[PDB]
Amino acid sequence: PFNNSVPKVGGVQISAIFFALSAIAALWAFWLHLTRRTESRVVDRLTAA
Amino acid sequence: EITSNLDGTYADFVGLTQISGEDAGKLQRTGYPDPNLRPAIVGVFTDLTGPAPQGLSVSAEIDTRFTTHPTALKLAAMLLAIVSTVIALLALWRLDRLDGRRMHRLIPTRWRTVTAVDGVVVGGMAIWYVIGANSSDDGYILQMARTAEHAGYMANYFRWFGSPEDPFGWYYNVLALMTKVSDASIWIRLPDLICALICWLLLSREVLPRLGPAVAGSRAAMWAAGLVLLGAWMPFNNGLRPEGQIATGALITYVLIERAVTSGRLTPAALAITTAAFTLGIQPTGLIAVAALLAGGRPILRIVMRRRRLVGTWPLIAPLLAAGTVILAVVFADQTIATVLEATRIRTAIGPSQGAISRRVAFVFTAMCLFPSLFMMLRRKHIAGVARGPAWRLMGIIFATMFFLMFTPTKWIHHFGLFAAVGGAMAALATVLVSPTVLRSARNRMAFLSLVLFVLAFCFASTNGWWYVSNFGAPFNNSVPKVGGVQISAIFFALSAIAALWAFWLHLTRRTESRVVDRLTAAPIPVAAGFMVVVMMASMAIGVVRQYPTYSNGWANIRAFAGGCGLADDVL
Amino acid sequence: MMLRRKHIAGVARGPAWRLMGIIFATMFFLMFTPTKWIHHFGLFAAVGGA
Amino acid sequence: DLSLSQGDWIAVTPPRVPELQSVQEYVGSDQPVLMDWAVGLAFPCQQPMLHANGVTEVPKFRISPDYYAKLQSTDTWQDGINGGLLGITDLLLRASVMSTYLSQDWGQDWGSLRKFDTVVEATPAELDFGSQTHSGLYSPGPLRIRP
Amino acid sequence: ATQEEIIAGLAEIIEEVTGIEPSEVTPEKSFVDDLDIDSLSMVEIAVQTEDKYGVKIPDEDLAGLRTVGDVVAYIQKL
Amino acid sequence: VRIARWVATIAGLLGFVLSVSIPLLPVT
Amino acid sequence: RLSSAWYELPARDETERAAHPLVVITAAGTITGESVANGLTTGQTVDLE
């Protein structure tokens, strides 16, 4: 698939897709740090294994 | 007539018809529509001599994007934004004094109690300021600071196409103003001395008492903080590469966010916002100050929610975002957003788009102090003497800066400058953690002493080589340091393996009480840091006295008082 | 997690700690001291699976 | 020449007693020099080839670091392909390195000093300047960079 | 809460700020003669006491009453 | 108070609006 | 292997000796020399007798 270049699915590289979703999860964690929720189900359904 | 515009290069012959080819209207419009293919004007040269024929006139427009100064509107806007934010800050200070608590007894009682560690990390810091090594990019900063006054736009002199690294360079304008007076190496590096002194004077007197009663009570803790400070400060930021100022500013915004938590006010937090903005403003590796503001953000937001009930929510958040954005008044002093984005796209277009006895120290003074302190802070949920809050924020600064500075930002790896300030206090946290009164098991302490000697073996493996001219007459600049035939790295690896087997025997037999370990592992962090400090100051002392009648770093800085050049005076 | 929680419910603390100690102890006299090109994952295919 | 290999040989020129002078004596603080990025702090007295409103002064000398750092690190940082000062001076001037000796430390590669020489008469330009332009965020086009 | 709950709670807040376990924390021992606090650190415990008890401690009465019997004898002055 | 809150908010948002507008201003 | 003719050295004076520390030859090729970057390496043996 990408022996010569960086893997890019859909124009921009998939590394950028993982870094964007990592930054989204990072800010979603920091907002729970500030507000101090610890109970939103959305996280339970997301981080199950 | 010949032209070469942005969409030009059509060197056409007006009124002439081509002889072979197509006629295309017989106008000889020939060229390529391309800005890529433009000339590099170094001047204009000919061979014909004597009065100009009427028509001969090369009149080129040179590139003049960045050499600008702001008009009256932009200057008045800057002065008004500055006076408006200081008005807003003092209005916040007036509004915030509703709990009383007036500023009484200035210079708090834990200050002015000077001890031997202060005299050591002041005298040895002054001696390193005189004779010590410079940074790698010392000349890179000095030269552009010298030319920037006459040029008037802080040009990144060497690499890019005269582009101003004015996206973030204001500290170089401080150096440029400093260079109005004589630019001897003894004098232009005065911010690296002043920020070292106020770094120490903040660390010993305002960080470590905040960190807890245990770290303040123990002498070994302040001694370890001093020696790790000095040992991390002396290789990297005793030049002009501005990582002592970023370390100092990250320490300032940390201790100000500490002041904001402990006092229950908001104006030290509001100052810590603009201080973090300025230390972000020094370099793009000044993200440690933002990391400190983030990892001390939750109590600030608690203080906001605390003062939300009494006053409006909006007059508290407003001066915060004011002090957050006043960085733009200083950074965009003579640079329009267009020209900074142009400098950015040149720097990403052709720049880099993402090994010595005392330059691999970074593994010694965070990577084996912060990790055992982290494991101790995790295992023991409540220790006696360590304030869990600011200790965890002190961890979070060092950890959070790694995850968006070490791996994502493009700045050569192997940095220790930044953690000279706050990673100094981390060692003071670590040494009371691994002290025999907190760690009860002698097995863990002996394994930690084995980790100390293993890391010191890892550090001495390379050659004692300083960057450029510091390297003039050094003990082992060419070879690996070998005292007494076999290398000293082998001596540290043998003593590390001895401590490792001495720990494993305590693991098997399950002793935990042999005094020999207590007497051996009583504060191993300041012993290791003292050994690194002494070997570096010995390396450079042997360097200056070995090469005495010629040019050393120390003899150059001493002779600079006599009105002499550093290296030019003795290059025949 | 094994450090912060002193006794978890469902994890045998003994063999879990020996499983950690294998991965940690091999690093301190195989990764840094032994000369075998870095970037190895083969060995931890078995025990680093668990 | 006790060597049967083809990659071994020597050349010899008769000995001399050179009329040595210090750098500060010869190169004062008047002639601008192209101090390379690795060596600015060591030479504090000579003003560099300061530039004014997009044009530079013609450099006379090129004080430079040690040979290995000069070849591997310095020259790659300053060439025309990525901006650089050696885009303009190598295109205009002719560099001819001289001999330099670090005093009482003979056998130490301190660096080098290269005397530039022009190729024509090379009068300095007049440069008629006009200064009224007030853009908001108007950057006229991108600069010329590598393809 | 007279001299038990309040003392223990305030020692939990001392534990929060000065990092000393709530065993050593008693009224007989104090700030600068036995435990280790400072002029600046005592504002943290002061504002937290203003937090769980509505007792706006003057900045001068805070420093005036010197021991940790100060905090007990004052929180019981509603 | 009610005499410091209003100046704190007008000078807060004034400094904000002014500082963010500083890159997009004219230059000679 | 060549032994050169003798060269007339300058006058016996210390004020001459001061500012003439070096006697220099503009040699070339692989030659045994005592650098400080590396040790006393061995090219060919040319030296001032």
Residue numbers in the entry:
A (entry chain B): 641 to 689
B (entry chain A): 149 to 502, 521 to 738
C (entry chain B): 542 to 591
D (entry chain A): 936 to 1082
E (entry chain C): 3 to 80
F (entry chain A): 23 to 50
G (entry chain A): 838 to 886
What do the authors report?
Furthermore, EmbB has been shown to play a key role in forming the characteristic terminal hexarabinofuranosyl motif of AG, which is the template for mycolylation. Together with the other Emb proteins (EmbA and EmbC), EmbB belongs to the glycosyltransferase C (GT-C) superfamily, whose structures comprises an N-terminal transmembrane domain and a C-terminal soluble domain located on the periplasmic side of the membrane. EmbB is observed as a dimer along with an acyl-carrier-protein (AcpM) associated with each protomer, thus forming a heterotetrameric EmbB2-AcpM2 complex.
The EmbB2-AcpM2 complex is captured in two states, one with C2-symmetry and the other that is asymmetric. Thus it is possible the ethambutol inhibition mode on EmbB2 similar to that on EmbA-EmbB complex by inhibiting substrate binding.
